[PDB]
């Protein structure tokens, strides 16, 4: 259809949602998920070590 | 007047040929992807990754064509 | 070069490294250079050409088998 | 209300443009000429949906627990691991940017497409009668300007990473020498690889635009042409298919973004 | 054309679409979430058994 | 006013080429799906999933073509 | 004179391309079906049930073009 | 006069496209039927049954195109 | 002019497309015939009987266009 | 009068399409003939008979087309 | 004037379609000949004989086309 | 005037053919890529390099067509 | 002026169709040559010689078309 | 006038059909090249030579068609 200035206004909205997401959203969620994964992995690892 | 008659036909040719090209290219590629998935299940995710790698390249020119046909239809005519 | 083994049900018929071979595979004459992709096929009775490292050709007669 | 079906279908394809020369609303019957006329309906629904995404994810990222997760936390972490695996499957660099970029792309484009499912004339009717606005169309991804906006952002990332991760020297070598590998063919090589570089972002944006535009345009047609007592038997079998389309057209955007950024550096 | 009739037909079609959704699209999502919480509980159960 | 008949032809060509593309792409794809089922008949519900995942792409451009042809044939004409 | 004539030309092109599309697509699909029936005949009642599902999708889009060609010929005259 | 003289050309287009579509579809289908009959010669009467089953679906769209082409030539023009 | 010359063009289209279809379909079908005859050099009569069975159906619908093109040229023009 | 050129155009179309079909169908059939002959190199006197048996059918409609093209060119025009 | 001008196009179509048919048919047949040669290199002098035997049949019609094209371009011009 | 109406049609045909060509060529090339990965997926990183090496040439000309089509549509207009 | 504007289209049809035919025929033949050479690297020169022998047959008619298209475009203008 | 716009139409036909040919034939050839490389990964440098050998004759005619398209377009 018709190109518009909106292609420029939307580039502001895009970049800003990527920075706030990158900083606040992603790092903590991945931190929590990895914190669960590590605990179960190493707990069972300790379990099989003591068994032997 | 004389404009819209021919401009609609131009967009029509453009997007018809785009539809032929993208449909046939993806049909072949997906047929090979499905034979590969039937051959070796448990690789479905990796083959699907590669399938999208290629499908992204297949549809480029057809999608420029679709975009410019819609441009002609709703911008010029 | 790669390692070729020709073995019967009874005795070993050959071994060692090889540059290439030519077999008359079931679906047609065939040639296996190094690094060849994994292949499995029956082969028709006849001679199998070997060229041992340093180009020493020799023919073995094979009544048939699976390559 | 003298709506001829060819005219009702017309009004629905009208954006609610505001002119930046005088901050005035561009009426549908005469379209002013200028590049300075923001489409307001979409940018709102776009910033609003990105805000809704970010708020939903933040009200959990600030609380997520490593015990047995709640039924809502679980839904978010599911998509988190999904995007994270799609990234790990197609990217090995150390950049912290790629994963959140792909997450935002996937969820935001998915929400924008989701608008396509609602009854076409609900929000437009409320927007005309209750508020008074002349026109409204509520699908952000069914408009050119937003889609290529994201494509050009990802294009600038393509260039940034292509320069950073192999320097101007390797970049200029790749552009010129390939694909014919001889310095005789350099002149032509620049055209092919040059546009082929240009082809990626343009095609990225148009893949989403065309699909969402022409999936909306159907609801406008089914709505206008068929009598009320016949609309459902052709409408619902279309929405059941667009539920697949809206998912695939966001997932492909995410995947191709990841691919262009990872194949650029490595 | 009457515009009210169109708003009637769209409402009918949207009701029908929601009724499809509830009975084919929503149950799978809740099943996935429930099965991932089952999995996570078991995996925490694994660490509890390992301490035992 | 001669305008109309030509627009009907422009819609006819769009929908015809779209029909060819979307029919042959899905035919090629479904042929591979079926030969895959014949080999691993218990996997059918998984290959149906992959087949519907891929078929949504074959019908990307052909369905846009159908939409715009049906539009021109009615909305414009 | 030539207004009503050309409508028939557009219906002709539309239905001709729709016929090629559906014909070739179901030809390929049924060819792969027959091959799967040949390789495992005791499995035919299942491959047929999957064949009809796929065939429904294949011809689906040629058949609205068939409907619109019949519309153009008779209804629009 | 041009009006019906061109209807003759319209029927020509329609049923020529129908002819090639049905011919190639049945050719592929029959080629696969013969390969099946060659792999399991004890099975021919069953595979031929299935072949006739699906060949009715193949030509179904071609056959109405043939009917309408003949109509346009004899009835209309 | 317009009366006689176009009818020859309609016959030309009819009997060119009929030629395309009736040639390529039988080429495809006979390729599998000759492959079966190379796999089972005893069955050749049975497979050629099946080949004619199917080939009658293959060639039938082109022959409608063939007779109709001869009609258009001689009977009409 | 100008009419005479469209007759040459019609014969050009008709004979070109007949040449396309008569070339490609026999190309396929002969490709399979050779593929079968490489397997059983002693069955050439038999496969080469079956080859002509089928090839007689391929070229028939193309031969009708070619003869009518020659008639249109020299006799009528 | 057009009696001169159009004829160059009417031979253009003839010698385009002749070239496509001959090139594609001989490409297929020579490809099959080559794969036969690679598998049975000893049979090369036999498969070459049979290849030349068959090529003269595919080359049959395309040379009618090309000779009539040369005639029309130079003889009637 | 007629200039722009015809120039849009020229660009439309050029980009349409370009899209068909590039899409189907990359579709075939990618189908072969995917089958070669399906047999052994550790050569994915290597086959996926040779794939781009060849796709760069497959899509050489089609972008010459796109490049000039865009020129005609936006520069000659 | 009025005369010359159509001879460039007469050349265009010849050379577009000849480029398609020659390109695709040599593509097939070279693909089979590369397959046979990938089976047997030792026969590569013999297969190359047979390839070049058949390839001369491949592009004969296409090259007649190229010569005549260049003639028309630069000698008849 | 009517003269020039038809020149661009013929140039477009030439340069589109040349694109069809040069894409489809090199796709058909490169597919076989790739599977052969996946088969004899050591002979890749050997097979790529023959691949270019044949690629040249594949491109033979499409390049003449392209040059005449550019001629008709800009040089007349």
Residue numbers in the entry:
A (entry chain X), E (entry chain Y): 1 to 52
B (entry chain J), F (entry chain L), G (entry chain Q), H (entry chain I), I (entry chain P), J (entry chain O), ...: 3 to 79
C (entry chain H): 3 to 69
D (entry chain a): 4 to 269
N (entry chain R): 3 to 78
Give the authors' words.
A key component in the generation of cellular metabolic energy is the F1Fo ATP synthase, a biological rotary motor that converts the proton motive force (pmf) to adenosine tri-phosphate (ATP) in both oxidative phosphorylation and photophosphorylation. The enzyme is comprised of two rotary motors, termed F1 and Fo, that are coupled together by two stalks: a central “rotor” stalk and a peripheral “stator” stalk. The Fo motor spans the membrane and converts the potential energy from the pmf into mechanical rotation of the central rotor that, in turn, drives conformational changes in the catalytic F1 motor subunits to generate ATP from ADP and inorganic phosphate (Pi). Here we have used cryo-Electron Microscopy (cryo-EM) on detergent-solubilized cysteine free E. coli ATP synthase13 to probe its structure and understand its rotational dynamics and coupling.
Focused classification of rotational State 1 highlighted five sub-classes, here termed Sub-states 1A, 1B, 1C, 1D, and 1E; with resolutions of 3.1, 3.3, 3.1, 3.2, and 3.3 Å, respectively. The defining theme of these sub-states was flexing of the central and peripheral stalks, with the majority of the flexibility seen in the peripheral stalk which bends and twists, together with minor movements within the central stalk. Independently, the movements seen between Sub-states 1B-E do not facilitate rotation of the c10 ring and instead illustrate torsional flexing of the entire complex. Sub-state 1A was in one rotational sub-state (here termed Sub-state 1’), whereas Sub-states 1B-E were rotated by a single c subunit relative to Sub-state 1’ (here termed Sub-state 1”). In State 1 the un-stretched spring corresponds to an Fo rotation angle in-between two of its 10 preferred rotational sub-states. The maps presented here were generated from material imaged in the presence of 10 mM MgADP and all showed the enzyme in the “autoinhibited” state, with the C-terminal domain of the ε subunit (εCTD) in the “up” inhibited position interacting with the F1 catalytic subunits. In the cryo-EM maps of the intact F1Fo enzyme in the presence of 10 mM MgADP, all α subunits contained ATP and Mg2+, whereas the contents of the β subunits varied: β1 bound ADP, Mg2+ and Pi, β2 bound only ADP, and β3 bound ADP and Mg2+.
